[PDB]
């Protein structure tokens, strides 16, 4: 499996930032994402629309247009540069109250605009305290993965919301490397799984080489190139 | 008064839309303001093509902070750099999907102030609300809740929602009026209340000639230059 590190910058990022956003993609010239604001996809796409680094969003709606305002469409995402886009992810699925079935109906729509969708999932304190992380990630992984995907077409990032050693992350990636397998067959072994928690230079190493971590999906880390390239710079170890 | 008239996309528009918001941008380039409140992927292209014209360009909602961990967020900050001079905060399709409260929408128009953004706010009550004769005491709560201590008539517009006829308009926008003067004095007077039910070719004169009705915040009428122009005519008769 080829590695996927992924950089998620969040609510941060303006046309001051291009140049930062250009020292990563240098430093790339595994497969390397950064999903930037959608205000900034364009610019980003023109800077970067030939070269290695992949582009991407950071959520997007269930419908392919219509009267919702201040969303984005999957197709707006594609057509402004993205090639992927995060859905799920933990600060949405709270605040917005994004179900597994909410999350699942972004996927479709990411699918048919033509964008991999990156898949976060991921227990609460309460749940790990409660000993049901597998009882929530069997769910989530079931209603949040549409019939229909393919290694292709997703990639997953385990969140540790309660937070995680690498011990807990090993155990974590088998639970859901098995899990694909057992819905997907041997195409879902091939679905990337990325670890979504604290990664840092400091202990990329350790991530990174644990079994069944096919890669990161990194937030404050990911906001500089100096850091950001420190932690893709594992792999030549 | 400045009469203003706001179209508001909603989840339509991309490069391919850029033709029409020319249009739109030609036809008005005298007695009023117009704003056009496109997707957050294509405002900076909006802003390169129409930033020297007489329209102005808007976004559709931003997030309470001004960077920071909030997955698939954009910041008012991001949309003033991005070409934004206004932002529609609390439109009724994300107060209901989202849970916008009175509190939230007010964090927002403070993170619009702070960028140097012109907040569209919207209030609006329900079919059941209407139904039990609650319109007036909704408005109150939401005028009061929704509005931060600090605003001008520069710096907010108000959008009235019948989210559920002339003399509902009337009755509704005096009282609106007579609020912000209750609150903010004089220069309450002068904060612009536009109408943002259903505004079409066929009911834009009686609508914008109504008593404190200083314009329209339009959707569906203002994908399309022919029938946003037809409404923005009525100020030459």
Redesign the interface.
Known sequence: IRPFIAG?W???????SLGELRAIAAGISFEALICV???????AFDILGGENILLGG??C?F?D?????????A???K??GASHV?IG?S??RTV??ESDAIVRAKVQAAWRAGLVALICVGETLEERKSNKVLDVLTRQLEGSLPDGATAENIIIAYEPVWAATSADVAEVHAFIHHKMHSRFGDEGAKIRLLYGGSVKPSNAFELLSTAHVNGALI??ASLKAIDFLTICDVYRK
């Open positions: 998620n969040k609510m941060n990022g303006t046309g001051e604001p959608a205000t900034l996809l364009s610019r950071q959520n709606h419908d247009y219509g009267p919702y305002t201040g969303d984005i469409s197709f707006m995402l057509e402004a995060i992810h600060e949405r917005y109250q937030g404050g």
